[PDB]
């Protein structure tokens, strides 16, 4: 059998960041990933990092490229009802910012650091199964070139995202699920074009939501809301750019640099929370435990807060012999998760066009934007949520 201290299922950002923090702390860990390295690196996903995530990447020793290439944002724009309003995040949050740096780059940075350090990752780990979670000697089985291997461990971190095995390794009756599926998705287009703005632009347009985001001075990420029936094959680059422009202020659409896509995909929008987030020696983190609609840019940032919490409780278990504190993992994480889920639901509700909206709902949506963007107190609630609420001790 292989033997480690912490088995990690998934080499996405949750599992890589947990693994790097544990490795540097001298806690033995093994990542098992079903896909190949290139497959994982193909996923586009996050653009917007909270300071908590930036700081955890620095703590993991992986922040050199982010420090050169990351973009610090002090504000964000909401466009609605023919108005353009800047939220001064840095003023209204009491001096906090967010950092733009692609999830593909964070993942690459972690993968290069894990390889450099000589820590253990098994890619193409097929048919992962989890065993004996309520014992002192849990273990993982998997297949590698069709040979069945066993990994003995003390603890398992389920970092295997929404359709991982880890959440399905807990008896359903021990969990409560809280879910909302939104009646639209985001059509996303990544292009090697200069961004149309130095800051993000969220647009609530009568034709539907649009977002102007970015990865660098030379790479942009745009989205438009589409119905759930839509197929990415029916959206040429040309059709995408024409619809995006239709949804933006004419002075923004006029200056937009267009170009052929590097990636196009439709992402469903979902809110999902499980409670609790652990079972015996198994702890769930990131998308294995919870999903947010991307309007709030919180999923990778909540994976970061889960991993930080699990990392600090594991430090207590191994360095101080205080393994009983791991009982608190779910309660700590879920306080932060629910407030980020609330903010993500609010952003989704106020910025999108919903089918079968009545006249009162339309006016309430517009009034929500008018009040929140016209009040110092309202603007402060958006800013503190956008930069992220503090990590709990």
Ligand X SMILES: Cc1cc2nc3c(=O)[nH]c(=O)nc-3n(C[C@H](O)[C@H](O)[C@H](O)COP(=O)(O)OP(=O)(O)OC[C@H]3O[C@@H](n4cnc5c(N)ncnc54)[C@H](O)[C@@H]3O)c2cc1C
Angle of CA points 184, 185, 186, to nearest 5° = 135
Select from 128, 140, 170, 210 the one that contacts ligand X (CB under 6 A).
128
247 interacts with ligand X by CB under 6 A: no
Contact 4, 152 (CB under 8 A): yes
Q: Residue 152 carries which DSSP code?
A: E
- Which of Br ion, ligand X, a second copy, none sits in contact with 367, Cβ below 5 to 8 A by type? a second copy
Site for ligand X in 34-53 (CB under 6 A): 34-35, 40, 45-48
Question: Contact at 8 Å (CB) between 23 and 117?
Answer: yes
**Under DSSP, is residue 3 helix (H, G, I), strand (E, B) or coil?**
strand
Stretch that binds a second copy, among 215-223, 254-262, 295-303, 379-387 (CB under 8 A): 379-387
Count how many residues are written for the chain.
Answer: 393
Among the listed ranges 233-241, 299-307, 325-333, 360-368, the one in contact with a second copy (CB under 8 A) is 360-368
Nearer Cβ to ligand X (297/324): 297
Residue 381 binds which entry of a second copy, ligand X, Br ion, none, with Cβ cut-offs from 5 to 8 Å by kind? Answer: a second copy
Site for ligand X in 159-218 (CB under 6 A): 159-161, 164-165, 186, 188
d(CA 33, CA 125): 5
Q: Which position among 123, 345, 354, 391 is part of the footprint of a second copy (CB under 8 A)?
A: 345
Instruction: Decide whether 218 or 361 has the Cβ nearer to a second copy.
Output: 361
Partner whose binding site includes residue 208, from Br ion, ligand X, a second copy, none (CB under 5 to 8 Å by kind): none
* 314-373 positions binding ligand X, by CB under 6 A: none
Which of these segments, 138-146, 234-242, 245-253, 371-379, binds a second copy (CB under 8 A)? 371-379
Q: Does 172 bind a second copy (CB under 8 A)?
A: no
Minimum CB distance to ligand X smaller for 208 or for 286? 286
Check residue 354 for interaction with a second copy (CB under 8 A).
no
Q: How far is the CB of 295 from Br ion (least distance, A)?
A: 8
User: Are 12 and 159 contacting, i.e. CB atoms less than 8 angstroms apart?
Assistant: yes
Give the phi and the psi of residue 253 in degrees, each rounded to 5: -60, -40
Q: Which residue has the tokens 């390889």?
A: 115
Q: Is there a contact between 6 and 22 (Cβ–Cβ < 8 Å)?
A: yes
339 contacts which partner out of ligand X, Br ion, a second copy, none, CB within 5 to 8 A by kind?
A: a second copy
Strand order in the sheet with 98-100: 48-50, 98-100, 71-73
For residue 37, the surrounding DSSP H or E stretch is helix 37-41
> Locate tokens 């640099």: which residue?
257
Instruction: Establish if 220 lies at the interface with Br ion (CB under 5 A).
Output: no
Distance CA 259, CA 391 (A): 40
Near a second copy in 250-309, by CB under 8 A? 271, 273
Q: Which residues touch 315 (CB under 8 Å, ≥6 apart)?
A: 25, 27
Residue 31: beta bridge partners?
A: 8, 121
Q: How far apart are CA 335 and CA 273, in angstroms?
A: 11
Residues that bind Br ion (CB under 5 A): 44, 102-104, 292, 294, 299
Residues that bind a second copy (CB under 8 A): 176-180, 271, 273, 338-339, 341-343, 345, 358-360, 363-364, 367-368, 370-371, 375-378, 380-381, 383-384
């Amino acid at each position: 059998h292989m033997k480690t201290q912490v088995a990690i299922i998934g080499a996405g950002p949750s599992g890589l960041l947990l693994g790097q923090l544990l490795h540097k702390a001298g806690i033995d860990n093994v990542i098992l990933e079903r896909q190949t390295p290139d497959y994982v690196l193909g996923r586009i996903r996050a653009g917007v990092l909270e300071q908590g995530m930036v700081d955890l990447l620095r703590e993991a020793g992986v922040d050199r490229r982010m420090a050169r290439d990351g973009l610090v944002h002090e504000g964000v724009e909401i466009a609605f009802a023919g108005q353009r309003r800047r939220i001064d995040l840095k003023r209204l949050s009491g001096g906090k910012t967010v950092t733009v740096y692609g999830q593909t780059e964070v993942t690459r940075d972690l993968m290069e650091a894990r390889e450099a350090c000589g820590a253990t990752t098994v890619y193409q780990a097929a048919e992962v199964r989890l065993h004996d979670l309520q014992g002192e000697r849990p273990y993982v089985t998997f297949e590698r070139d069709g040979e069945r291997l066993r990994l003995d461990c003390d603890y398992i971190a389920g970092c295997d995202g929404f359709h991982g095995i880890s959440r399905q390794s807990i008896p359903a009756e021990r969990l409560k699920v809280f879910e909302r599926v939104y009646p639209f998705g985001w059509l996303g287009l990544l292009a090697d074009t200069p961004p149309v703005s130095h800051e993000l632009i969220y647009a609530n347009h009568p034709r539907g939501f649009a977002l102007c985001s970015q990865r660098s001075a030379t790479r942009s990420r745009y989205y438009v809301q589409v119905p759930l029936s839509e197929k990415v094959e029916d959206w040429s680059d040309e059709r995408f750019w024409t619809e995006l422009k239709a949804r933006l202020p004419s002075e923004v659409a006029e200056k937009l640099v267009t170009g052929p896509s590097l990636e196009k995909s439709i992402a469903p929008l979902r809110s999902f929370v499980v409670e609790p987030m652990q079972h015996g020696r198994l702890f769930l983190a990131g998308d294995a435990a919870h999903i947010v609609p991307p309007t709030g840019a919180k999923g990778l940032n909540l994976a970061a807060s889960d991993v930080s919490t699990l990392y600090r409780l594991l430090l207590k278990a191994y360095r101080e012999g205080r393994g009983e504190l791991l009982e608190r993992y779910s309660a700590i994480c879920l306080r932060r998760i629910w407030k980020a889920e609330r903010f993500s639901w609010w952003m989704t509700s106020v910025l999108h066009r919903f089918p079968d909206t009545d006249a009162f709902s339309q006016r309430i949506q517009q009034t929500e934007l008018e009040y929140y963007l016209g009040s110092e107190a309202g603007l402060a609630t958006i800013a503190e949520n956008f930069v992220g609420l503090p990590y709990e001790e």
